[PDB]
Amino acid sequence: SGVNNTKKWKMEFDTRERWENPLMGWASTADPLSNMVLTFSAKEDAIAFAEKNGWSYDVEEKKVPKPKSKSYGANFSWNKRTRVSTK
Amino acid sequence: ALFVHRDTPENNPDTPFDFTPENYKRIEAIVKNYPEGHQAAAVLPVLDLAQRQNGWLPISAMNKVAEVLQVPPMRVYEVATFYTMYNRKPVGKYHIQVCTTTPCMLRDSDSILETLQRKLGIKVGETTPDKLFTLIEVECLGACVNAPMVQINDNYYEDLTPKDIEEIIDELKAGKVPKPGPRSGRFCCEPAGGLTSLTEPPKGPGFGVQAG
Amino acid sequence: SNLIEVFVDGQSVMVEPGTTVLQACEKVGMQIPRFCYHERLSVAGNCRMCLVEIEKAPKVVAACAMPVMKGWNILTNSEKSKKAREGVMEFLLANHPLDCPICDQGGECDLQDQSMMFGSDRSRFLEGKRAVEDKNIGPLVKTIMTRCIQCTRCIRFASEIAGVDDLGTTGRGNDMQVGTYIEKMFMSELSGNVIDICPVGALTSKPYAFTARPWETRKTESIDVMDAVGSNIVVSTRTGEVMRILPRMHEDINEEWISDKTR
Amino acid sequence: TTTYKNLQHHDYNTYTFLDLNLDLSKFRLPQPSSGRESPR
Amino acid sequence: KVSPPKRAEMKTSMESLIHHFKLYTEGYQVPPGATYTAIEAPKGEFGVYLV
Amino acid sequence: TSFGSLKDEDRIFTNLYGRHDWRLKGALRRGDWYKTKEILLKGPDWILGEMKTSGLRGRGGAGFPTGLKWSFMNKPSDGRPKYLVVNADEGEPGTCKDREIMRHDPHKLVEGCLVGGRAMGARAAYIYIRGEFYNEASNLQVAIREAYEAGLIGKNACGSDYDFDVFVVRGAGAYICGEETALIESIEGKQGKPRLKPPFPADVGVFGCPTTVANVETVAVSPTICRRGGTWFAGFGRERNSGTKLFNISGHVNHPCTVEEEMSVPLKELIEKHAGGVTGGWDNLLAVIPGGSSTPLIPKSVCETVLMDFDALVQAQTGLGTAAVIVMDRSTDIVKAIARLIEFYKHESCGQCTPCREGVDWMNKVMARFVKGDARPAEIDSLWEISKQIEGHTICALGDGAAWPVQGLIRHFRPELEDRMQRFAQQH
Ligand SMILES: Cc1cc2nc3c(=O)[nH]c(=O)nc-3n(C[C@H](O)[C@H](O)[C@H](O)COP(=O)(O)O)c2cc1C
Ligand code: SF4
Ligand code: SF4
Ligand code: SF4
Ligand code: FES
Ligand code: FES
């Protein structure tokens, strides 16, 4: 339920082949540029950083959760339909 | 004790149990004891109504309650795993549960436990081969004053000596329920040889009316 | 305008009524620990870990439930709001079976941290733990209910998001144990979401039983298929392979979770 | 009086209690309704 | 949280197990900050600008 | 003053341990149902008016003020009815008081559900009760039918507009159901799992409807405290702690009793005057309890000068709850006893709060090791420290009832434990 990994603007890159090393069973690659996390602080700065190196950025926006009303007593209504069971 | 089912044959959800129609007619009094909605609230006496038609509430009888009430079956077990008054295991005829908390312990209930244990075979919490007595070490019973204390499925025997327990059980095996009540003569909770509070005929009606 | 002055170490916040202390403190960032609470399930203070000293009070309040009135100043890092936690986590960790390396949820435990972040170093518990029987729900969901923490965060899923009412709480005391009283299989839609919910690794997914460990994953965010909802997903890789399916939070599609088929 | 006049609690069966409320439903008024039949 | 516990003590006392499971995976979780330490090794002012 | 005698004219729960028609036709003989008409018709706000002037505080564990508690719902309509509830569940080890007032004067109880029901404004009262009290509770429905036969309840409170009924509900033997709220959920037909208290019972309770969770004394006193007190009744006890009280005594005594006196009497006289003195003498009386069980100990160093006020005892570090007095003499294993109380709460608590599932059971194991003495002493102040980790960390005040028996045991009898630490230490 912890959410500190949010508040940031990681800019990982796409993935490419990860073949199986036929000797050991190991996994190996060609693209060194795959494990390339980068922590930013605002989206307006990220595009400025990637455009500054010409890379075809592809943004996804924030997904803010709503502020929800959760009233404990409404679990225990006379009229209504939220009458919980098992306390 | 284990608080979960193990679908034995004698305790499977197809055993013979069903409320006699006298008992159905007792339900609709209890569901008109509680409002139209919230008819799922009668679970305590209703499920206890089966306890009195028979001990050892089977899995099937619990599931019957859901049928009369259309409550989820799981919400039946929740109650029956919780309260100690009910009985899910095959119990005896008498269910002689006893206090062992401090004031009744302090008044030598262990001897009442020994004399009772010494003469039946049941250590603490199991049956006789006759299926009559199922001793239980329970904790309090409300009558903490009349200090030694037991219970016979609804009754109350109190102020009972180690000698008096022998007097009891010699009757129950081949007799009747021998007068639920205290010994040493104290009526309910008299001061045991001389009463001191009332000592008079109380005041009749309208004594001390504050001008209403 | 239906807003209430509320204080958090001096903040001048304004919040709608009927809001907890969390929904206030969550604005700023004073993220409070959580075991009984989810942002979508009913409220029930059973864990009693979200405690805090409201200013000018001898008693603390379960912030999961206590709404927020005018003029209230909170002290999240008080001595009394940490003593209230170092004790609690030092209670939970007295019947828990030390199975972290066994546990499916190594880095995905919301208890290991919250014993580190706020729990103490030492478990003075030295008497002897308890045990609990293991269950046989089904092939999707393993059960280790020796480490269940009586949080009620599962049984309030079936009863308010899937409509089943079978995973009751059986018993009392430490002797209490969640699970059916009987031997029934909870193989219905959304039954797999219960794994993401149990923060403890008590119950967890049999397919991803032990195939991996979460820090090892390289997580890629992608979309459901196989139903026309097009809900969202977190995919878990390991060395160019696949091990889990996990959901993202979009507030419109599904809400937070997925169905067992695409899991 | 020095005689125990609560004597009439020994000769009760296990059904005696609820058998009384079987009678009481006639002495009683009708009850509310939550609109619903139950929480369904 | 800053040192691993006694190996006989991680093996019964729960909390010492969890820290042992997170020290050797995650670790200390330092605060942000910065230093320039120093020490005269045989060479001289060996020091670290850990950030 | 030097009160404590209570000339028997002011016995309020007469036929306490007695006879002579507990049934109807003889409760009327004692003074009951007499002026219920204008007691009822005059008004609710008048009744809550007088009860506050009566200085009648709680009679369960908290001693909370009435009037206040009931005036929390004198509200106008909201859409759904107003109920009333009674803790006929005695509970504690020592409280037999409500195994007695039920029989021997049931009608007085019935008044308060009726009178107090309109003094708040209600529709119908439910009496949960301990599911062991079968023949006990059976005495009620006999009394309650005859009420309806007398036209006293049902469309007509003695011939008035305030329709009302007195339904009774049977528990299943659980001390937590004696609590204010899980009671409501037990009555609701669920596990006895309590609630949290921004939704007070007066805003939402049984059936999602508001309630007044009274106890037996606070209501059975209502008829003959409102027609015969309000200012007179206040003269008894003391200023905050005014009234009378159905005390009860058990343990290491000649004649244990259920006596009631002018409240806040000094503790010594309750063992001297009534309920004849402890066995042996007064080098005996090792570690009394004033309250039932959720109150701490008292080491006889104060038990001379005790004054049984709720609040003067808070200098004594106890809080008078049910006032089910327990007494202990010299020749005892006290740590066996006080540990049984944690063996009691272990078998008992609902198992919902984290620091009661495994705080109580945790203390159970520790004290159980102290009785044998094969522990070590450094726990003795740790075990204190955890007792403080449960005070304000639990839904219901059981934790306050499960901690204080220990803290009081430790506030005085630290060294008695230190001996057993040495006695075993000799045994390797
Ligand atoms: C664990 C626990 C058990 C309790 N059991 C009872 C009980 O059995 N009977 C009772 O009257 N009160 C019991 N109480 C106290 C009730 O809250 C109290 O009786 C009730 O609030 C009535 O308050 P009053 O005295 O103002 O009427 C219990 C409290 C706790 C914490
Ligand atoms: S739930 Fe699993 S990972 Fe978390 S503390 Fe318990 S055993 Fe360790
Ligand atoms: S199984 Fe998990 S979610 Fe369910 S009660 Fe136990 S700890 Fe909570
Ligand atoms: S303190 Fe114990 S008995 Fe009271 S609500 Fe919490 S778990 Fe239940
Ligand atoms: S303590 Fe023995 S009956 Fe209550
Ligand atoms: S996290 Fe708030 S009471 Fe559980």
Atom of ligand 2 nearest to the CA of C103: 2
For CATH 3.40.50.11540, list the domain ranges present in chain F: 56-235
Atom of ligand 3 nearest to the CA of C197: 3
For domain F333-428, give the fold. de novo design (two linked rop proteins) (1.20.1440)
Look at residue C13 and give its three-state secondary structure. strand
DSSP lists the bridge partners of residue F83 as: F124
Q: Give the closest residue to C114 by CA, choosing from C216, C35, C213.
A: C35
Closest CB to D14: pick one of B32, B35, B153: B153
Distance F398 CA to ligand 4 centre (A): 6
Q: Do B72 and A85 touch (CB under 8 A)?
A: yes
φ, ψ of residue B75 to 5 degrees: the values are -70, -5
Tokens of A44: 């307006």
The Cα–Cα gap between F409 and C258 comes to: 54
Top mutation candidate among C147, C148, C150, C210 for ligand 2, by most atoms within 8 Å of CB: C147
- Which residues from chain E sit within 8 angstroms of residue C116, using beta carbons? 1, 18-19, 22
- Kindly tell me the burial class for residue F140, based on how many C-beta atoms sit within 10 Å of its own C-beta (0-12, 13-18, 19 or more): buried
Q: Would you list the DSSP string of F287-322?
A: SBBSSSSSS--B-SSSTTT-B--TTGGGTTT---SS
DSSP lists the bridge partners of residue C143 as: C203
Q: Are residues C223 and C205 in the same domain?
A: no
Q: Are residues C226 and C207 in the same domain?
A: no
Which secondary structure element, helix H or strand E, spans residue F409, and what is its range?
Answer: helix F398-412
CA torsion F6-F11-F12-F16 (nearest 10°) is 130
* Most E-contacting residue of C116, C117, C120, C130 (CB-CB within 10 A), to test interface: C116
CB F113 within 8 A of CB F125: yes
Q: Give the closest residue to B97 by CA, choosing from B146, B137, B43, B60.
A: B137
Q: Give the closest residue to F40 by CA, choosing from F167, F165, F161.
A: F161
The Cα–Cα gap between A36 and B145 comes to: 76
- Kindly tell me the burial class for residue C151, based on how many C-beta atoms sit within 10 Å of its own C-beta (0-12, 13-18, 19 or more): buried
Q: Are residues C71 and C45 in the same domain?
A: yes
Distance C195 CA to ligand 2 centre (A): 14
C-alpha dist (Å) from residue F37 to B170, F114, F118, F161: 54, 11, 12, 11
What interhelical angle do B59-69 and B43-53 show, nearest 10?
Answer: 140
Tokens of F323: 């006032």
Amino acid identity at A15: T
Atom 2, ligand 3: residue with shortest CA distance: C198
- Ligand 3 pocket residue status of C149, Cβ below 6 Å: yes
The Cα–Cα gap between B83 and F204 comes to: 25
Look at residue F165 and give its three-state secondary structure. strand
The Cα–Cα gap between F181 and F350 comes to: 12
Closest CB to D34: pick one of A79, A82, A85: A79
CB F225 within 8 A of CB F53: no
Chains in contact with chain D (at least 3 beta-carbon pairs closer than 8 A): A, B, F
The Cα–Cα gap between C100 and F290 comes to: 48
CB C123 within 8 A of CB C93: yes
CB F268 within 8 A of CB F282: no
Angle at B119 between CA B116 and CA B125, to 5 degrees: 55
The Cα–Cα gap between F357 and F353 comes to: 6
DSSP lists the bridge partners of residue F213 as: F85
Three-class secondary structure assignment of F101-161: CCCCCHHHHHHHHHHHHHHHCCCEEEECCCCCCHHHHHHHHHHHHHHHHCCCCCCCCCCCC
Q: Give the closest residue to F304 by CA, choosing from F334, F272, F276.
A: F272
Greatest Cα-to-Cα distance within chain D, rounded to the nearest angstrom:
58
Atom 25, ligand 1: residue with shortest CA distance: F58
The Cα–Cα gap between F107 and F30 comes to: 11
Protein residues whose CB sits closer than 6 Å to any atom of ligand 1: F 58-62, 64, 66, 69, 87, 89-91, 175-176, 178-180, 213-215, 218, 396-398, 401
Within 10 Å of residue C246's Cβ, how many Cβ atoms? 19
Q: What contacts C113, CB < 8 A, 6 or more positions away?
A: A2, E22
CB C28 within 8 A of CB C21: no
- Which residues from chain A sit within 8 angstroms of residue C18, using beta carbons? 69, 71
Q: B180 — contact with chain D (CB < 8 Å)?
A: yes
Look at residue F194 and give its three-state secondary structure. coil
Within 10 Å of residue F311's Cβ, how many Cβ atoms? 17
Closest CB to F355: pick one of C66, C91, C172: C91
Q: Do B78 and C170 touch (CB under 8 A)?
A: yes
Look at residue F37 and give its three-state secondary structure. helix
The Cα–Cα gap between B132 and B90 comes to: 11
HSE value, Cβ hemisphere, 13 Å, CA-based, for C161: 23
Within 10 Å of residue E34's Cβ, how many Cβ atoms? 7
The Cα–Cα gap between F16 and F26 comes to: 13
Q: Cα A25 vs. chain centroid, distance in angstroms?
A: 30
Strand-strand pairing, F83-87 and C13-15: unpaired
Tokens 């042992």 correspond to what residue? Answer: E20
CB F201 within 8 A of CB F180: yes
- Kindly tell me the burial class for residue B4, based on how many C-beta atoms sit within 10 Å of its own C-beta (0-12, 13-18, 19 or more): middle
Q: What contacts F343, CB < 8 A, 6 or more positions away?
A: B139, F364, F368
Tokens of B204: 């009749």
Greatest Cα-to-Cα distance within chain C, rounded to the nearest angstrom:
56
DSSP C20: B
φ, ψ of residue F62 to 5 degrees: the values are -90, -25
Atom of ligand 6 nearest to the CA of C44: 3
Q: What contacts F403, CB < 8 A, 6 or more positions away?
A: F387, F388, F390, F391
Domain regions of chain B by residue span: 17-90, 91-196
Within 10 Å of residue B74's Cβ, how many Cβ atoms? 25
Homologous superfamily of the F56-235 domain (CATH) = NADH-ubiquinone oxidoreductase 51kDa subunit (3.40.50.11540)
Structure's resolution in angstroms: 3.9
The Cα–Cα gap between F368 and F370 comes to: 5
Greatest Cα-to-Cα distance within chain F, rounded to the nearest angstrom:
79
- Which residues from chain F sit within 8 angstroms of residue C90, using beta carbons? 389
| The total number of structural domains that make up chain C | 2
For chain B, positions 45-104, list CB contacts with chain F under 8 A: 45, 48, 75, 78-79, 82-86, 100-104
Distance C219 CA to ligand 3 centre (A): 26
For CATH 3.10.20.600, list the domain ranges present in chain F: 236-332
- Ligand 5 pocket residue status of B105, Cβ below 6 Å: no
Q: C150 — contact with chain A (CB < 8 Å)?
A: no
Q: Are residues C82 and C194 in the same domain?
A: yes
Distance F129 CA to ligand 1 centre (A): 13
Amino acid identity at A65: P
CB C148 within 8 A of CB C200: yes
For CATH 1.20.1440.230, list the domain ranges present in chain F: 333-428
The Cα–Cα gap between F256 and E41 comes to: 84
φ, ψ of residue F422 to 5 degrees: the values are -90, -40
For residue C232, the enclosing domain spans: 213-263
Q: Do F355 and C171 touch (CB under 8 A)?
A: no
Give the chain C residue nearest A13 (alpha carbons): C220
CB F29 within 8 A of CB F21: yes
Closest CB to F80: pick one of A73, A78, A85: A78
Angle at F93 between CA F88 and CA F97, to 5 degrees: 40
Give the chain A residue nearest F200 (alpha carbons): A73
Chains in contact with chain A (at least 3 beta-carbon pairs closer than 8 A): B, C, D, F
For chain A, positions 13-72, list CB contacts with chain C under 8 A: 15, 17-20, 27, 29, 35, 60, 63-72
The Cα–Cα gap between B178 and B194 comes to: 25
Q: A1 — contact with chain B (CB < 8 Å)?
A: no
What interhelical angle do F360-372 and F398-412 show, nearest 10?
Answer: 30
> Binding site residues of F for NADH, as ranges?
58-67
The Cα–Cα gap between C45 and C21 comes to: 13
Q: What share of chain C is helix, strand, coil (3-state, %, to 5)?
A: 15, 15, 70
C-alpha dist (Å) from residue F253 to D16, F284, F288, F296, F303: 37, 11, 12, 20, 16
Q: Give the closest residue to B154 by CA, choosing from B81, B93, B88, B89.
A: B93
CB F322 within 8 A of CB F292: yes
Q: Give the closest residue to C181 by CA, choosing from B40, F191, B38.
A: F191
Closest CB to D31: pick one of B29, B36, B181: B36
- Ligand 3 pocket residue status of C178, Cβ below 6 Å: yes
The Cα–Cα gap between F124 and F113 comes to: 8
C148 is in an annotated binding site: yes
The Cα–Cα gap between B4 and F116 comes to: 44
CB F199 within 8 A of CB F71: no
C-alpha dist (Å) from residue F90 to B69, B199, C6, F322: 30, 27, 42, 9
B87-116 in b/e form (b: 16+ CB < 10 A) is bbeebbebbbbbbbbbbbbbbebeebbebb
The Cα–Cα gap between B81 and A86 comes to: 13
Q: What contacts B105, CB < 8 A, 6 or more positions away?
A: B99, F336, F337, F340
Amino acid identity at B5: H
Q: Are residues C189 and C230 in the same domain?
A: no
Q: Give the closest residue to A3 by CA, choosing from A53, A61, A64.
A: A64
The Cα–Cα gap between F269 and F265 comes to: 8
Domain regions of chain A by residue span: 1-87
DSSP E40: E
F177-206 in b/e form (b: 16+ CB < 10 A) is bbbbbbbbbbbbbbbbbbbbebbbbbebbb
The Cα–Cα gap between C14 and C6 comes to: 6
Q: Are residues C37 and C111 in the same domain?
A: yes
CB B45 within 8 A of CB F170: yes
The Cα–Cα gap between C191 and C183 comes to: 16
Which secondary structure element, helix H or strand E, spans residue C72, and what is its range?
Answer: strand C72-75
Q: Would you list the DSSP string of F74-87?
A: -----SS--EEEEE
DSSP A18: E
Q: Would you list the DSSP string of B113-151?
A: HHHHHTTTS--SS-B-TTS--B-EE----S--SS-SEEE
The Cα–Cα gap between F381 and B152 comes to: 44
Tokens of C32: 């409070």
Q: C87 — contact with chain E (CB < 8 Å)?
A: no
Phi-psi label, residue E16: left if phi above 0, alpha if psi -120 to 50, beta otherwise? alpha
Tokens of F175: 């001390």
DSSP F57: B
- Which residues from chain B sit within 8 angstroms of residue F29, using beta carbons? 204-205
Strand-strand pairing, A27-29 and A18-20: antiparallel
C-alpha dist (Å) from residue F310 to C232, F1, F240, F392: 61, 16, 9, 20
Angle at F411 between CA F407 and CA F417, to 5 degrees: 90
CB F130 within 8 A of CB F171: yes
HSE value, Cβ hemisphere, 13 Å, CA-based, for D34: 24
The Cα–Cα gap between B109 and B104 comes to: 6
The Cα–Cα gap between F281 and F330 comes to: 10
- Ligand 4 pocket residue status of F394, Cβ below 6 Å: yes
Q: F168 — contact with chain C (CB < 8 Å)?
A: no
Tokens of F223: 């008829």
Q: Are residues C67 and C5 in the same domain?
A: yes
Angle at F9 between CA F8 and CA F15, to 5 degrees: 70
Q: What contacts B8, CB < 8 A, 6 or more positions away?
A: none
Q: Would you list the DSSP string of B47-69?
A: HHHHHHHSSS--HHHHHHHHHHH
C-alpha dist (Å) from residue F281 to B104, F167, F249, F306, F329: 21, 48, 17, 18, 9
Q: Do F209 and A78 touch (CB under 8 A)?
A: yes
- Ligand 6 pocket residue status of C32, Cβ below 6 Å: no
The Cα–Cα gap between E21 and E16 comes to: 9
Distance F242 CA to ligand 5 centre (A): 29
Q: Cα F142 vs. chain centroid, distance in angstroms?
A: 25
Check: CATH 3.10.20.600 for F236-332?
yes
The Cα–Cα gap between F84 and F126 comes to: 6
C25 is in an annotated binding site: no
- Kindly tell me the burial class for residue B20, based on how many C-beta atoms sit within 10 Å of its own C-beta (0-12, 13-18, 19 or more): exposed
HSE value, Cβ hemisphere, 13 Å, CA-based, for F318: 31
Tokens 């009985």 correspond to what residue? Answer: B87
Q: Do A78 and D36 touch (CB under 8 A)?
A: no
C-alpha dist (Å) from residue B118 to A56, B121, B162, F333: 88, 7, 11, 24
Q: What share of chain E is helix, strand, coil (3-state, %, to 5)?
A: 20, 10, 75
Evaluate whether chains E and D are touching (3 or more beta carbon pairs less than 8 Å apart). no
Q: Do F196 and C65 touch (CB under 8 A)?
A: yes
The Cα–Cα gap between C233 and C241 comes to: 16
The Cα–Cα gap between C46 and C68 comes to: 20
The Cα–Cα gap between D7 and C250 comes to: 71
